[PDB]
Coordinates of C-alpha atoms in Angstrom, one line a residue:
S1 CA -69.9 -16.1 -65.5
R2 CA -70.5 -13.9 -62.5
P3 CA -71.2 -10.2 -63.2
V4 CA -69.0 -7.6 -61.6
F5 CA -69.2 -3.8 -62.0
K6 CA -66.0 -1.8 -62.0
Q7 CA -66.5 2.0 -61.6
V8 CA -64.6 5.2 -60.7
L9 CA -66.0 7.3 -58.0
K10 CA -64.9 10.9 -57.3
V11 CA -65.3 12.1 -53.6
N12 CA -65.0 15.8 -52.8
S13 CA -65.3 16.2 -49.0
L14 CA -62.7 14.9 -46.5
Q15 CA -65.5 13.4 -44.3
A16 CA -66.8 11.1 -47.1
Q17 CA -63.4 10.1 -48.4
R18 CA -62.3 9.2 -44.9
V19 CA -65.4 7.0 -44.6
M20 CA -64.7 5.5 -48.0
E21 CA -61.1 4.8 -47.1
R22 CA -61.4 3.0 -43.8
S23 CA -64.6 1.0 -44.5
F24 CA -65.5 0.3 -48.2
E25 CA -63.0 -2.5 -48.8
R26 CA -63.8 -4.2 -45.5
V27 CA -67.6 -3.7 -46.1
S28 CA -67.6 -5.1 -49.6
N29 CA -65.5 -8.0 -48.4
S30 CA -68.1 -8.5 -45.7
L31 CA -71.0 -8.4 -48.1
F32 CA -69.2 -11.0 -50.2
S33 CA -68.6 -13.3 -47.2
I34 CA -72.3 -13.0 -46.2
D35 CA -73.5 -14.0 -49.7
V36 CA -71.2 -17.0 -49.5
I37 CA -71.9 -18.1 -46.0
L38 CA -75.6 -17.8 -46.6
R39 CA -75.4 -20.0 -49.7
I40 CA -73.6 -22.6 -47.6
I41 CA -76.4 -22.6 -45.0
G42 CA -78.9 -23.1 -47.8
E43 CA -82.1 -22.4 -45.8
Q44 CA -84.1 -19.8 -47.8
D45 CA -85.7 -18.8 -44.5
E46 CA -82.5 -17.6 -43.0
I47 CA -81.3 -16.2 -46.4
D48 CA -84.3 -14.0 -46.7
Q49 CA -84.1 -13.0 -43.0
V50 CA -80.5 -11.9 -43.3
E51 CA -81.0 -10.2 -46.7
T52 CA -83.8 -8.3 -45.1
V53 CA -81.9 -7.0 -42.0
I54 CA -79.0 -5.9 -44.2
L55 CA -81.5 -4.1 -46.6
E56 CA -83.2 -2.2 -43.8
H57 CA -80.0 -1.0 -42.1
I58 CA -78.9 0.4 -45.5
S59 CA -82.4 1.7 -46.0
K60 CA -82.6 3.5 -42.7
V61 CA -79.3 5.4 -43.3
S62 CA -80.4 6.2 -46.8
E63 CA -83.7 7.5 -45.6
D64 CA -82.0 9.7 -42.9
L65 CA -79.5 11.0 -45.5
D66 CA -82.4 12.1 -47.7
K67 CA -84.2 13.8 -44.8
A68 CA -81.1 15.6 -43.8
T69 CA -80.5 16.6 -47.4
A70 CA -84.1 17.7 -47.9
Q71 CA -84.1 19.9 -44.7
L72 CA -80.7 21.5 -45.4
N73 CA -81.5 22.0 -49.1
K74 CA -84.5 24.0 -47.9
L75 CA -82.3 26.2 -45.7
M76 CA -80.4 27.0 -48.9
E77 CA -83.4 28.3 -50.9
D78 CA -84.7 29.8 -47.7
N79 CA -81.5 31.8 -47.6
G80 CA -81.1 32.2 -51.4
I81 CA -78.0 30.1 -52.2
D82 CA -77.8 28.3 -55.5
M83 CA -74.0 27.5 -55.6
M84 CA -71.8 24.8 -53.9
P85 CA -68.1 24.8 -53.1
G86 CA -65.1 23.4 -54.9
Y87 CA -62.7 21.2 -53.0
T88 CA -59.0 21.4 -52.4
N89 CA -58.2 17.8 -53.5
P90 CA -60.9 15.3 -54.5
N91 CA -60.0 11.7 -54.7
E92 CA -61.0 9.1 -57.4
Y93 CA -61.5 5.6 -56.2
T94 CA -61.8 2.6 -58.5
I95 CA -64.3 0.2 -56.8
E96 CA -65.7 -3.3 -57.6
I97 CA -69.4 -4.0 -57.2
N98 CA -70.2 -7.7 -56.8
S99 CA -73.5 -7.4 -54.9
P100 CA -76.2 -4.7 -55.4
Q101 CA -75.9 -4.0 -51.7
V102 CA -72.2 -3.1 -52.3
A103 CA -73.5 -0.5 -54.8
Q104 CA -75.9 0.7 -52.1
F105 CA -73.1 1.3 -49.6
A106 CA -71.1 3.1 -52.2
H107 CA -74.2 5.1 -53.1
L108 CA -74.5 6.0 -49.4
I109 CA -71.0 7.5 -49.5
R110 CA -72.1 9.7 -52.4
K111 CA -75.1 10.9 -50.5
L112 CA -72.8 11.6 -47.6
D113 CA -70.4 13.5 -49.9
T114 CA -73.4 15.4 -51.2
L115 CA -74.7 16.3 -47.8
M116 CA -71.3 17.5 -46.7
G117 CA -71.2 19.8 -49.7
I118 CA -74.5 21.3 -48.5
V119 CA -73.2 21.6 -44.9
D120 CA -70.0 23.4 -46.3
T121 CA -72.1 25.8 -48.3
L122 CA -74.3 26.8 -45.3
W123 CA -71.1 27.1 -43.2
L124 CA -69.3 29.3 -45.7
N125 CA -72.5 31.3 -46.1
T126 CA -72.7 31.8 -42.2
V127 CA -76.0 29.9 -42.1
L128 CA -74.5 27.2 -39.9
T129 CA -72.2 27.8 -36.9
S130 CA -68.7 26.4 -37.1
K131 CA -69.7 24.2 -34.2
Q132 CA -72.7 22.6 -35.8
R133 CA -70.8 21.9 -39.0
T134 CA -68.4 19.8 -36.9
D135 CA -71.4 18.2 -35.1
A136 CA -72.7 17.2 -38.5
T137 CA -69.3 16.3 -39.8
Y138 CA -68.7 13.9 -36.8
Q139 CA -72.2 12.4 -36.5
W140 CA -72.7 11.6 -40.2
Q141 CA -69.2 10.2 -40.5
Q142 CA -69.9 8.0 -37.4
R143 CA -73.3 7.2 -38.8
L144 CA -71.8 5.4 -41.9
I145 CA -69.1 3.9 -39.7
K146 CA -71.9 2.4 -37.5
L147 CA -73.3 0.8 -40.6
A148 CA -69.9 -0.7 -41.5
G149 CA -69.6 -2.2 -38.1
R150 CA -73.2 -3.5 -38.1
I151 CA -72.8 -5.2 -41.5
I152 CA -69.6 -6.9 -40.3
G153 CA -71.4 -7.8 -37.1
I154 CA -74.1 -9.5 -39.2
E155 CA -71.3 -11.3 -41.0
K156 CA -69.8 -12.4 -37.6
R157 CA -73.2 -13.6 -36.4
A158 CA -73.7 -15.5 -39.7
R159 CA -70.4 -17.3 -39.1
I160 CA -71.6 -18.5 -35.7
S161 CA -74.9 -19.5 -37.2
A162 CA -73.0 -21.5 -39.8
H163 CA -70.8 -23.0 -37.0
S164 CA -74.0 -24.1 -35.2
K165 CA -75.1 -26.0 -38.3
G166 CA -71.8 -27.9 -38.5
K167 CA -71.0 -26.0 -41.8
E168 CA -67.9 -24.5 -40.1
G169 CA -65.0 -26.1 -41.9
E170 CA -66.8 -25.3 -45.2
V171 CA -66.8 -21.6 -44.3
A172 CA -63.0 -21.5 -43.5
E173 CA -62.4 -22.8 -47.0
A174 CA -65.0 -20.9 -49.0
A175 CA -64.7 -17.5 -47.4
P176 CA -62.2 -16.8 -44.6
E177 CA -62.8 -13.9 -42.3
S178 CA -60.9 -10.7 -42.9
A179 CA -59.3 -8.6 -40.1
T180 CA -61.1 -5.4 -39.3
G181 CA -58.3 -2.7 -39.2
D182 CA -60.5 0.1 -37.9
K183 CA -61.2 0.1 -34.2
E184 CA -64.4 2.1 -34.4
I185 CA -65.7 -0.4 -36.9
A186 CA -64.3 -3.5 -35.1
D187 CA -65.8 -2.4 -31.7
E188 CA -69.2 -1.8 -33.3
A189 CA -68.9 -5.3 -34.9
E190 CA -69.9 -6.6 -31.4
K191 CA -73.6 -6.3 -32.3
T192 CA -73.2 -10.1 -32.0
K193 CA -74.5 -10.3 -28.4

């Protein structure tokens, strides 16, 4: 009755498979709880407002990932590099896609994995310092982790919105909240204030 997309996703770089590991399950559970809590609140005004804010936070990170990919791909042709590296142990992850936004987050991880492959090419080809590879490794990792925490923060602020509409006990039954096992994500979840 409800459509669900099951897919296998290969991730090459360690930065993107670490981001995938400590966030994708919690994020796709958060996107699920949001779609359920919003259907309990009913008000199409709030539904479209929350659907929008989630869309634009995923859009901003996607827009920045493309800009960083476009700039760094220019540095490759500027420097005459047409190849990209193999990886010691890539991982395959079987994922379930219930929302199209869940697909968007998983697509963001692929763009991250792609951008890391470009960074690693420029670093192996002495175009990028060892220091500015780590600065890109940390910041883009932390960039997706900030999104994970913000999405969950939107979920948490939706639960208080549902509480303020008396629909609280309904939420506890329909979609209970999941523990956030990653501290970086859990701390960022306090975009509630």
